[PDB]
């Protein structure tokens, strides 16, 4: 159980604020991996 997806929008804060949103609003972002899980599964 897991970081970015498309978190640029925080859903309008309709249900509190998750830890990811609180982290994002102060300079802490997560870059997505270069190889998606589909490509990793293709390699496997």
């Amino acid at each position: 159980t897991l970081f970015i997806k498309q978190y640029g929008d925080c859903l309008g804060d309709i249900a509190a604020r998750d830890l990811i949103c609180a982290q994002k609003f102060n300079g802490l972002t997560v870059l997505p991996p270069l190889l998606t899980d589909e490509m990793i599964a293709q390699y496997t």
């Binding site: 309008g12 804060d13 609180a22 982290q23």
Partner: protein, 48 residues
């Protein structure tokens, strides 16, 4: 709209939206899990 608010002396910068959060009558301004101001109450219209 991204604005430089000043609510009863509390300064900041951000978009203000209507909140589904229901403040209890004694409360004034909310806080996030990481202890940052998340919601405020308008000193004039008593809106959250």
């Amino acid at each position: 709209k991204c604005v430089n608010f000043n609510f009863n002396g509390l300064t900041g910068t951000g978009v203000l939206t209507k909140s589904n959060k229901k403040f209890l009558p004694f409360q004034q301004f909310g806080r996030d899990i990481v202890d940052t101001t998340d919601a405020v109450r308008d000193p004039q219209t008593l809106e959250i």
